[PDB]
Amino acid sequence: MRAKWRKKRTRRLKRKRRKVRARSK
Amino acid sequence: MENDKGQLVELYVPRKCSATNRIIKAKDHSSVQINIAQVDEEGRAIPGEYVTYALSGYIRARGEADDSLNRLAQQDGLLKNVWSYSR
Amino acid sequence: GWVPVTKLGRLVKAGKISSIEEIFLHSLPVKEFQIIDQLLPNLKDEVMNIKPVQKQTRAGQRTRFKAVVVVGDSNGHVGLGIKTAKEVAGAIRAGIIIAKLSVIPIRRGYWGTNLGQPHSLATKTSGKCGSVSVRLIPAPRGSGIVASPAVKKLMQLAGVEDVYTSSTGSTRTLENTLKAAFVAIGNTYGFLTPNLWEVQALTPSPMDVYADYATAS
Amino acid sequence: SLPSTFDLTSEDAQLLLAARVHLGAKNVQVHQEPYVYKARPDGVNVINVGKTWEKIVLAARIIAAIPNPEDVVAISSRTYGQRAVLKYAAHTGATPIAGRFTPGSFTNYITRSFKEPRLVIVTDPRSDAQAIKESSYVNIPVIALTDLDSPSEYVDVAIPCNNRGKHSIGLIWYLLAREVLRLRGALPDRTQPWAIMPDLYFYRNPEE
Amino acid sequence: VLVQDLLHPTAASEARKHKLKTLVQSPRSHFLDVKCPGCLNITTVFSHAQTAVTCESCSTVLCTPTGGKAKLSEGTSFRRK
Amino acid sequence: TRTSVLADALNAINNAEKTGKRQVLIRPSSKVIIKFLQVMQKHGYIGEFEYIDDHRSGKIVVQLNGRLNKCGVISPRFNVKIADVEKWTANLLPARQFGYVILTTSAGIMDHEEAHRKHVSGKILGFVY
Amino acid sequence: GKGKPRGLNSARKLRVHRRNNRWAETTYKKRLLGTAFKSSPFGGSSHAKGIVLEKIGIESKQPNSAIRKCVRVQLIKNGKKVTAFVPNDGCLNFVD
Amino acid sequence: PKKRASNGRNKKGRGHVKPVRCVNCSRSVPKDKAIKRMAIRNIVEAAAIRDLSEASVYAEYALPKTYNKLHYCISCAIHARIVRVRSRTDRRIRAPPQ
Amino acid sequence: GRVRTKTVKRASKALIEKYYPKLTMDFQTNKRLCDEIATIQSKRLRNKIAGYTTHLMKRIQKGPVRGISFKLQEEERERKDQYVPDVSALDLSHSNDVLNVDTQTAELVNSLGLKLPLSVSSVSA
RNA sequence: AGGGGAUCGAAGAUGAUCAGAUACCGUCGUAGUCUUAACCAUAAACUAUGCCGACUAGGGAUCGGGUGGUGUUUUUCUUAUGACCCACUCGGCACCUUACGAGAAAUCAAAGUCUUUGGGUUCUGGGGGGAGUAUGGUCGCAAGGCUGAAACUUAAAGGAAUU
Ligand SMILES: [Mg+2]
Ligand SMILES: [Mg+2]
Ligand SMILES: [Mg+2]
Ligand SMILES: [Mg+2]
Ligand SMILES: [Mg+2]
Ligand SMILES: [Mg+2]
Ligand SMILES: [Mg+2]
Ligand SMILES: [Mg+2]
Ligand SMILES: [Mg+2]
Ligand SMILES: [Mg+2]
Ligand SMILES: [Zn+2]
Ligand SMILES: [Zn+2]
């Protein structure tokens, strides 16, 4: 996997995580 | 070098380059000895008598060997105003 | 027996050069190994290692054997020879010859007070080959050689009795280390020390005194 | 020092001028050369001819000091000098090398062209560089016929000269030979201008 | 190269070298006695002006400023001090 | 900024020696530098040196015989405490027989041996061999 | 040159910088964070006594292949569960 | 490692050089990493000149040349044999062959 | 197809070097000579060698050839060499005295401290 | 959030190519591309070379300036500029050849003046993964940025060169 793609994936994951956190709040 | 009982140790004392005063090593396959013969009247060049100059390899490699040689010559008088001190 | 190419060899054969000292002084190139044999009768030959050394071909791989040989007595003379051949014995033999050809003098000295007969090196000397830097330091009497076994052997051969070492870099590649050590040893002459300040004669070379004995006519 | 007979006497100077030794320094100039005397307004530097003469004399003095005639090696790869070199060899003791040098000549004790000189004379460092390089490996001193352009690496005694030349190199060679002979005692007097010609050196292309 | 007398070099060489980079620093500029074609008065004009120097009695403009050395006004005649 | 002048001088000298020159042109020139040079001269590591007056800082022309194989300042002038000199000597000098550690004491600028003789110590300066 | 300060009054910087750097040295980090006590199944101790839960054969990594004969142990001191290899050819049938 | 000390570009003293598009495929390439071949082709092909001459009113006529500078992205150049792969030792030659 | 090997050509060269007098021109004689002198094992090889020698000889009678030495050629060369122009190129007689020099050259001559018949110009770019 | 919206064009449509092809190729095409007020603070933001200072080796170029040339041309007669030409000189973007120095080497006039180790300074790294992740701060409207672990895992990951 390209590093850039990995980074992108991570970012995507983090968005979801953020959303989850917001929901929890 | 010198032992306490006076007498010398030191297996051989090395030659120093007449231009730099820097020591010539044993595997200095670049260094040189120039022999310039003692001249006489009617030229004739006296047999088995000469002024010797050691040049280290380093100077030769650099290029300023010739100049050094010239300088050396014009202090033993082998050349007459070739090399000038003020450049 | 022996029949010499090169003027120096011829001279040696004749008996016009008594010791390798003269050769060392006049930086004359020793190109026949027999000269060394003639002049240094007491050379011990130490084989340091034999390692495989490989080359990829379309079919299999060509393996050759690298022989590393140190040569010397105990009176300030050492040679170092690296040789690669396919036969091991042959490689060793060639290496020995190479080492002999190389043979160098050493400036053996005192640590402090010149009581009697030099034991150490005269100066702190370093040698660098590859990455390996071998620092050799003048040690006090009866401290022995303080070195990695390879270097130690070389030191012993040279005839240094007491010496400290500080080998740095990738010392594990033994050949390089050995080379560095050799370089360091060589460096001992060529250091301008106050007990060498004063200018001397500049003798005519044995290649010039006996010019007539040189060349086969 | 030299006893007054070794001054640049007029005839020699004239000869040098004719050759055009003084002329061919070229516009481009190596920093290891103070053999210059002015720079002609066109661009071509002028060599100090007295200095050159002195250098030649010095070289001769060295050559004489070599005890065995054959131990001196004269080299030329460039055609404008081969003939001259040969002539020098014929006159002096001297071993010649003309044309191809063959590398591993001073090193490599197996070669048929294996020489052990104790002095090397070269027409040019620029073109016979290989020979010069080889000399370095075996402690052998190099007299070279440098113009004010050729590199001074491993050159011990340089004779400021012309290398565009044709005449000049040959003339220089002749002079070197003559001085050497005088030093030896092969020519009994210094005043007498020597029987043979400078033209006997030089170079001629196939013409018949 | 290798051996030189660094203390007293050749004059020409010194001249060639940059001011400051010489053995001892010294100006390359000089002062001038300027004669204006009209009146008999002598003014001491510095060779690298900057200002449009006039004669002390009459406004005539003796020198105009340039990059380095200032330019004299044609009718004027100078003599190096 | 020219933080150290002595250091610069020493470096220049070293450069000159390594390349085989027989003379250097030191450019800022001080008392300290002069003193250092004098020590070397006394010990015979240097020839005749002369101070050109610029009416500003100075300029030194130094003749080199060729014997000097390294100068070298040790820079942050460490306060050396008599028994500490030995350690310094062991570190900096290539042998136990020769070479000098130059140190500025209140008794003046001298080599370490001289200091020992006089029984004084101070701040270190440089070393020569 | 050289990245560090050298001046006779730098000292503090040399100290603090060194301290900062030290944290990249893993052993030091371990010592200072005290990961031998907080993590690690043995509480920074040379040995530990536990009670055998069961005997588990573990398949070795590559080049090799052999069932290794280990034991799942729960330590007395904290209650952490660990795998422990039983050395020598028999020996697994000494455990229970 | 560095394949080229020039980085294959030719800028150094600059900072940003404006890109030119490729003449073959429009691959946007910096104006220095550009491979600029200036083609002076004759407006009429070499074999068809005679016929044209024969046709033409006013004998002894100029017959013009068409001028354009072409910019090839390096890949394109490589493909189309404008540039060729050279040895490590002879990559260094900056002088054009002719 | 027909290109001669080392073992032919080198041998032929050697033969030529040794025996240029008495190894002359025509084939049969050359072959006979080869048979007499060289210890050639095969007949065909010998024949080939002879042919090569003949070829070399033929080439020779149109000028000298590289690698090929022989003691007569050297002598001839030497003879050729010993030629001198009676006037000489450095005689100055062609320039009708006063050798054409520049201003700088003249200055140099003066500074040396020498009297010479000189002719002075200028020359510019 | 306004204005502009010709071209080109993440998304989309949409025609082929393919086993698949919401990929390359083809045709359209909102956002964007331009701008005005804000924000954002990152790029292979690269010379992957921190800044200031000294010194060591030649060589031509070239740009900016300045000097000296009865040097060439310009011509409106001397001209006076200007443009050239030559020589020197500071400052710059580079380059060429040698390294006698460096370096693991590729290579480097610095990446030199380092086991012959110290001119002054700021920042950064300490096997590979886990991870630029978790967490806590803090700054952002948001995307994100700066800061930044550990458990556990692993005998290699890498660099330059070689056949
Ligand atoms: Mg690649
Ligand atoms: Mg800029
Ligand atoms: Mg950029
Ligand atoms: Mg789409
Ligand atoms: Mg489709
Ligand atoms: Mg498309
Ligand atoms: Mg970044
Ligand atoms: Mg970066
Ligand atoms: Mg890590
Ligand atoms: Mg790789
Ligand atoms: Zn007036
Ligand atoms: Zn393209």
Numbering used by the authors:
A (entry chain h): 1 to 25
B (entry chain V): 1 to 87
C (entry chain C): 39 to 255
D (entry chain A): 2 to 209
E (entry chain b): 2 to 82
F (entry chain W): 2 to 130
G (entry chain X): 2 to 97
H (entry chain a): 2 to 99
What is the paper's account of this structure, in its own sentences?
In the empty 40S subunit, this channel is closed because interactions between helix h34 in the head and h18 in the body form a latch (Passmore et al., 2007) that must open to allow initial loading of mRNA on the 40S subunit. It is thought that eIF1 and eIF1A promote the formation of an open conformation of the 40S subunit conducive to scanning (Pestova et al., 1998; Pestova and Kolupaeva, 2002). Binding of eIF1 and eIF1A to assemble the 40S•eIF1•eIF1A complex leads to an 8° rotation of the head compared to the empty 40S subunit in 80S ribosomes (Ben-Shem et al., 2011) that likely facilitates binding of TC in the POUT state to form the 43S PIC. Notably, the latch remains closed in both the 40S•eIF1•eIF1A and py43S complexes observed here.
Translation initiation in eukaryotes begins with the formation of a pre-initiation complex (PIC) containing the 40S ribosomal subunit, eIF1, eIF1A, eIF3, ternary complex (eIF2-GTP-Met-tRNAi), and eIF5. The PIC, in an open conformation, attaches to the 5′ end of the mRNA and scans to locate the start codon, whereupon it closes to arrest scanning. In the first stage of eukaryotic translation initiation, the 40S ribosomal subunit and translation initiation factors eIF1, eIF1A, and eIF3 form a complex that facilitates loading of methionyl initiator tRNA (tRNAi) onto the 40S subunit as a ternary complex (TC) with eIF2-GTP. eIF5, a GTPase activating protein (GAP) for eIF2, is thought to bind to this complex along with TC. Recognition of the start codon in the P site precipitates transition to a scanning-arrested, closed PIC with tRNAi accommodated in the P site (PIN).
